[PDB]
Structure formats: structure tokens, C-alpha cells
Amino acid sequence: EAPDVKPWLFLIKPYEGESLSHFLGRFRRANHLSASGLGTLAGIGAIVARWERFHFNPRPSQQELEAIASVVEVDAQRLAQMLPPAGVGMQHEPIRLCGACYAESPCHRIEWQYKSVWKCDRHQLKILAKCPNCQAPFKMPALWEDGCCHRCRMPFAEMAKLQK
DNA sequence: ACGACAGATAATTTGTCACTGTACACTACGCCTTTTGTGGAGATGTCTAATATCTACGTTTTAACAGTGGCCTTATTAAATGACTTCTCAACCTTCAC
Ligand SMILES: [Mg+2]
Ligand SMILES: [Zn+2]
Ligand SMILES: [Zn+2]
Numbered sequence: 001e002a003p004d005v006k007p008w009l010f011l012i013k014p015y016e017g018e019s020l021s022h023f024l025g026r027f028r029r030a031n032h033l034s035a036s037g038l039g040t041l042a043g044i045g046a047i048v049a050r051w052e053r054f055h056f057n058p059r060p061s062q063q064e065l066e067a068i069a070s071v072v073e074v075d076a077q078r079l080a081q082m083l084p085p086a087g088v089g090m091q092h093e094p095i096r097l098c099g100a101c102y103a104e105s106p107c108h109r110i111e112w113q114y115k116s117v118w119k120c121d122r123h124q125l126k127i128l129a130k131c132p133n134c135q136a137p138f139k140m141p142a143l144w145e146d147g148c149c150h151r152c153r154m155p156f157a158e159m160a161k162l163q164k
Numbered sequence: 165a166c167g168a169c170a171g172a173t174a175a176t177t178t179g180t181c182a183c184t185g186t187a188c189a190c191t192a193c194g195c196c197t198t199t200t201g202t203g204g205a206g207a208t209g210t211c212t213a214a215t216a217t218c219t220a221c222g223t224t225t226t227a228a229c230a231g232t233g234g235c236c237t238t239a240t241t242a243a244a245t246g247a248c249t250t251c252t253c254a255a256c257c258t259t260c261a262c
């Protein structure tokens with residue numbers, strides 16, 4: 001062993017509005033974990049691959065968030081802030097993006113999936129629901145490694161000027 | 165007396181020559197034995213490199229398959245089908261109609 005070392009893992013700081021799908025994707029990339037791997041590591045199994053698609057029948061339970069809060073050092077109350085608050089309706093399929101936010105903070109925001117959200121009040125821009133250059137839909141936020149459209153390679157920060 | 169002068173005289177050798185005894189008569193280096201150092205085969209003993217044989221050293225290659233790992237969405241309501249469960253399985257009397 002390395003003497004006086006504590007068993008450790010690569011951590012990531014969650015951004016102020018980062019979605020759980022985006023967060024788990026970064027944590028998985030930081031540790032080169034497959035989606036099945038993190039679920040086995042937390043012991044919740046295939047559930048992680050389901051959450052990364054925003055498939056929330058059922059929602060992330062107290063048990064499973066506290067389980068993920070054992071391998072991720074982020075506490076379960078902060079993990080619950082990566083999800084819609086109680087009774088806020090959300091949509092999983094059309095993945096959406098502000099772009100002007102992504103130039104400031106490279107994360108998907110869970111509020112971009114709310115059924116009540118359509119503009120960024122900070123930027124006063126209509127949030128995108130597909131790539132404005134090539135019309136390809138955005139991939140699940142767990143897969144936003146490159147920070148660009150997977151088809152035409154336009155960076156999300158440039159898509160800010162193609163909004164509203 | 166003895167012996168001592170010059171010369172006699174009985175030896176001594178030098179030289180002749182008639183006589184005779186003998187070889188020439190072909191007939192020894194030759195017959196035979198032993199040793200002996202040199203020499204010619206010719207049976208026999210001497211003793212190796214080497215071209216294998218003759219397995220093993222074990223070492224690669226295969227394929228079979230075993231184990232790890234990723235993925236796989238989840239809910240409601242209706243229908244069909246197959247099943248399960250539960251419940252039930254009175255009876256005598258009155259009244260008004262020919
Ligand atoms: Mg839709
Ligand atoms: Zn914005
Ligand atoms: Zn594009």
C-alpha cells in the first residue's frame with residue numbers, strides 16, 4: 001500500500017444548476033466508468049443508465065440517491081437539487097440548451113427540461129431544442145463530452161448567437 | 165830352463181770336376197660345418213573420428229471455452245386468452261281471480 005493514504009476516487013464539483021444526467025456523465029468520464037459500472041459500484045444496478053436518459057418512472061428514490069451519495073461525495077440533498085423539485089413537470093425527450101449559459105458554465109441545466117421553461121431569463125434568449133446550424137437533436141446530457149454538436153461539430157458556445 | 169829369433173810344416177780354406185740322387189711324371193686352397201646379422205613376407209593386434217540413430221529436451225501453436233464487462237426504461241388502462249378466489253343454489257303462506 002501507499003502508507004497513510006485514504007481510499008479515494010476522482011471527484012467533480014456540481015455546478016449551480018447542473019442536471020443529474022450531466023453530472024453523472026462527468027463523474028463517469030472523470031473515472032472512465034461505464035453507466036452500468038457506476039450502477040454496480042453504487043449497487044443500484046442498471047438504474048443509472050435509466051436516470052441518464054431522464055427516465056424517471058419511478059423518480060430517484062431516497063434510497064438510491066443516498067446510495068449514489070456514497071460513491072459520489074455529493075450529499076443526497078444536493079443530488080435532489082439536480083432534479084425537478086416536487087410537482088415540477090419535466091420532459092425527458094426534447095433535450096434543450098441555452099448556449100449562452102454553456103459559454104459561462106459547461107453544463108446542462110435541469111430547468112431546461114421543465115415544461116414551464118422556454119426562455120433563459122438571464123440571457124433573454126429562447127432556449128434551443130436542436131442544433132440551430134444542422135438541426136440535429138442534442139444527445140443526453142451524460143454524453144456532452146465535447147461541448148459541441150455531434151454532427152456538425154459547432155460548439156454550444158457559438159450556438160448562443162443563433163438563438164431567439 | 166825355457167822360450168825366443170827367422171823359418172819349416174801340418175793343417176786350414178779355395179777351387180776343380182767326375183759322379184749321383186732326385187724330381188719331372190700334376191694333384192690343395194677345397195669339403196664341410198656352424199653362427200648370425202640382414203631381410204620378406206604375413207597373421208595378428210591396435211584403436212579412432214564420424215556419420216549417423218534415436219530418443220528426449222521440452223518449446224510453440226491452437227482451439228476451446230471460461231470468466232469479466234456493457235447493455236437492456238418504466239407506469240397506466242383497455243382487450244383477448246389461461247387460471248385462481250369468493251358468493252349463491254328457500255318454502256310455506258296469503259290473496260285475488262272463475
Ligand atoms: Mg414530445
Ligand atoms: Zn442562458
Ligand atoms: Zn449541428
